[PDB]
Amino acid sequence: MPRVDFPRSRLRFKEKLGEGQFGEVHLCEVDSPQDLVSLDFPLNVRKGHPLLVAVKILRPDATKNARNDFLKEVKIMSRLKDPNIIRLLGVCVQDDPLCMITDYMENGDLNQFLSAHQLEDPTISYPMLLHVAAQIASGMRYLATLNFVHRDLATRNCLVGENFTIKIADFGMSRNLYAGDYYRAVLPIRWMAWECILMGKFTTASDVWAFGVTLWEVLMLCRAQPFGQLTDEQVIENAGEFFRDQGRQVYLSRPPACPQGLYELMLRCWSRESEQRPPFSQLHRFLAEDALNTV
Ligand SMILES: Cc1ccc(NC(=O)c2ccc(CN3CCN(C)CC3)cc2)cc1Nc1nccc(-c2cccnc2)n1
């Protein structure tokens, strides 16, 4: 827990960014942020330009369980300090409504960003795609070593900062744009390892599987939904085929930009056995070294 609340009186409402069962996320401008610049709030103020933040707000009539989960997220976010994980800027928890505040990325989520680019034969290069993926692996290494499981890794849950910096986040199913990526609890089945779908087992190994699918998205420049040839019920059936291990399971195809070795990395992320999936330390090393060294 942060020692002092961010002053709610400085948050100027701009836009509603999303909603869920227990609250909303708003885009706010911080009024006169130079007044707040301190050790507690080391805000990056650009004179002449508004300071924008995302604010997650718990409904004041939230249940006890909803409130506890919100405070659990506060506690988790207060620990996360890595260049490739979204940073908590402040909280409002002394009074209702409870709030968490992070930076707002004008470049949007990584899906939005890659969707707006084309592959260099605006453009983005294959080496930059590897850098994006390496950053995600590095953030995931950090999370896993702190004994967190993400459970919803995908390009839609990564934010694009300045100079191609990628921040892993977790927004939940709070945005209409990605409703088709979730199956009705509400689950991102196309990113989920077979054991998640069949047994509800979520682990770092299943985060690795999701990382494989996220890497696939990146190399596809977010042009195709994973398993777009399959209905939701068929995706669940595909998980059964991984369980069966009789060679009928469908794997995502190799993207045109993806060399065979990188594709085989992805296939290893989709190993039937968790213990055969590469750790994030290895995924990062492969992307930052092996793949980048073989352009
Ligand atoms: C305002 C806020 C409050 C909380 C969070 N929280 C997280 O992003 C997050 C990240 C990692 C974890 C780790 N956790 C481990 C356990 N498992 C099960 C889940 C994940 C938890 C929360 C983000 C935000 N930021 C946010 N939220 C929604 C939209 C945007 C946003 C949208 C567009 C551009 N810029 C920002 N930004």
Residue nearest to atom 13 of ligand 1 (CA): 150
**Cβ neighbours of residue 116 under 8 Å, at least 6 residues apart?**
122
| Spatial contact of 81 and 87, defined as CB atoms under 8 Å apart | yes
Instruction: Characterise 85 by phi-psi region: left (phi > 0), alpha (psi -120 to 50), beta (else).
Output: beta
Q: Where are the beta strands (DSSP E) in the chain?
A: 11-20, 23-30, 52-58, 88-92, 99-103, 118-119, 123-124, 158-160, 166-168
DSSP state of 187: B
- Residue (of 111, 264, 87) closest to 177 by Cα position: 111
Question: What is each CA distance from 222 to 57, 74, 99, 226, 264, in whole angstroms?
Answer: 30, 31, 31, 9, 20
Please state at what angle helix 260-269 crosses helix 204-219, rounded to 10 degrees. 150
Which tokens sit at 188?
Answer: 């991102």
Identify the architecture of domain 105-290 in CATH: Orthogonal Bundle (1.10)
Question: CA 232 to CA 183: how far, in whole Å?
Answer: 7
Name the 3-class secondary structure at 262: helix
Residue nearest to atom 2 of ligand 1 (CA): 56
C-alpha 45 to ligand 1 mean position (Å):
22
| Spatial contact of 58 and 70, defined as CB atoms under 8 Å apart | yes
| Spatial contact of 124 and 221, defined as CB atoms under 8 Å apart | yes
Instruction: Characterise 221 by phi-psi region: left (phi > 0), alpha (psi -120 to 50), beta (else).
Output: left
**Burial (CB count <10 Å: 0-12, 13-18, 19+), residue 79:** exposed
Question: CA 249 to CA 74: how far, in whole Å?
Answer: 39
One-letter amino acid at 114 equals L
Look-up of token digits 């034969």: 121
Which atom of ligand 1 is nearest to 106's Cα?
34
Write down the domain spans for the chain. Answer: 1-104, 105-290
Ligand-binding site membership of 18 (annotated): yes
DSSP state of 170: -
Ligand-binding site membership of 34 (annotated): no
Technique employed here was X-ray
**Cβ neighbours of residue 145 under 8 Å, at least 6 residues apart?**
none
- Residue (of 133, 136, 141) closest to 169 by Cα position: 136
Longest dimension (CA), the chain: 64
Question: CA 218 to CA 53: how far, in whole Å?
Answer: 26
Question: CA 170 to CA 176: how far, in whole Å?
Answer: 15
Give catalytic status of residue 152 as yes or no. Answer: yes
**Cβ neighbours of residue 72 under 8 Å, at least 6 residues apart?**
none
Question: CA 268 to CA 277: how far, in whole Å?
Answer: 5
Phi, psi of 96 (to 5 degrees): -80, 150
Please state at what angle helix 204-219 crosses helix 126-145, rounded to 10 degrees. 170
Name the 3-class secondary structure at 104: coil
| Spatial contact of 189 and 195, defined as CB atoms under 8 Å apart | no
Ligand-binding site membership of 21 (annotated): yes
CATH of domain 1-104: 3.30.200.20
State the DSSP string of 112-158: HHHHT-EE---EE-HHHHHHHHHHHHHHHHHHHHTT---S--SGGGE
Total count of residues recorded for the chain: 295
